[PDB]
Amino acid sequence: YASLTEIEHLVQSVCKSYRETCQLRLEDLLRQRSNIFSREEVTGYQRKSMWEMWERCAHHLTEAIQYVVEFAKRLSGFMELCQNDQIVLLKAGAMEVVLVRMCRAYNADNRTVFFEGKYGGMELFRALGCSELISSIFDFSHSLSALHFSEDEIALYTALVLINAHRPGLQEKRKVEQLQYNLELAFHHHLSKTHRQSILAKLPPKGKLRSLCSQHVERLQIFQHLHPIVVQAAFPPLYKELFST
Amino acid sequence: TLLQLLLGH
Numbered sequence: 688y689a690s691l692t693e694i695e696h697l698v699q700s701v702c703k704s705y706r707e708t709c710q711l712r713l714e715d716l717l718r719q720r721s722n723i724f725s726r727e728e729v730t731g732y733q734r735k736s737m738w739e740m741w742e743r744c745a746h747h748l749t750e751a752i753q754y755v756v757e758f759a760k761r762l763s764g765f766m767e768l769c770q771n772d773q774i775v776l777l778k779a780g781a782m783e784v785v786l787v788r789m790c791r792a793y794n795a796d797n798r799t800v801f802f803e804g805k806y807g808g809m810e811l812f813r814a815l816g817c818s819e820l821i822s823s824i825f826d827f828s829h830s831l832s833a834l835h836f837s838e839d840e841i842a843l844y845t846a847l848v849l850i851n852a853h854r855p856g857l858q859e860k861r862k863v864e865q866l867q868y869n870l871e872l873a874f875h876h877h878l879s880k881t882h883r884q885s886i887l888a889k890l891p892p893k894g895k896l897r898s899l900c901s902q903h904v905e906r907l908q909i910f911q912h913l914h915p916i917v918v919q920a921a922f923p924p925l926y927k928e929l930f931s932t
Numbered sequence: 933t934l935l936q937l938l939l940g941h
């Protein structure tokens with residue numbers, strides 16, 4: 688039964704773990720907002736091969752995932768969990784955390800995302816041949832951007848995205864449930880201080896993040912079946928492990 | 933697995 692002091696300490700700990708592993712500075716992402724891909728640059732990306740565009744994106748996603756792994760490692764409660772459960776949570780949660788974090792790189796005013804040094808719209812990704820997935824991801828980013836998360840809110844929310852006791856295959860489910868609840872208390876406490884509990888009802892349903900990850904896996908199946916050799920030869924091995932069937 | 937390796941266990 689975590690005391691108020693312990694909950695306050697948990698807030699600080701989660702926010703520190705996030706700050707240390709957030710990958711890019713928010714200020715740098717925001718500074719780059721005026722730097723938008725030109726019509727010709729966008730066309731250049733659209734004319735790339737499906738395999739090359741998938742390869743680029745898999746690399747960038749894997750890099751983002753490596754920071755999420757580091758985030759998990761610095762979350763004290765996470766390392767308290769058994770080895771199996773750490774793996775189960777990260778395997779299911781890594782992509783979900785990245786999707787949430789990416790809203791920092793999304794500009795709702797022109798519906799663009801920071802990708803390879805500049806801001807581009809969803810049409811930038813057309814060569815992937817998964818327009819429905821890209822649209823869904825942009826919709827998700829837009830929905831989160833409307834919430835106007837602070838960095839501390841992103842820290843606390845992403846901690847909860849990772850510590851999700853509903854994942855199948857947990858060996859110590861009740862232990863994960865306790866940590867999840869404590870992180871809920873931390874999140875709620877922080878929100879209470881800033882009069883921000885209103886956002887709780889506006890957060891995406893958990894099924895949404897699960898849906899996006901399922902869609903991603905399915906589109907990778909379509910790609911991998913079409914181009915099996917490129918996945919084997921060129922894609923990051925961690926990407927394969929997490930997403931290939 | 934690679935997650936195992938990255939987590940150091």
Ligand SMILES: CCS(=O)(=O)c1ccc(CC(=O)Nc2cnc(O[C@@H](C)c3ccccc3)c(Cl)c2)cc1
Pocket residue numbers: 709710711712743744745747748751785786788789790791792800801802803812821824825828
């Ligand atoms: C997440 C930590 S961060 O510090 O916020 C950060 C932000 C940006 C970058 C550079 C980068 O990887 N951009 C990128 C953008 N869109 C990408 O796909 C689209 C389809 C997308 C759009 C929104 C959400 C998910 C995916 C990819 Cl594959 C990479 C690095 C770090």
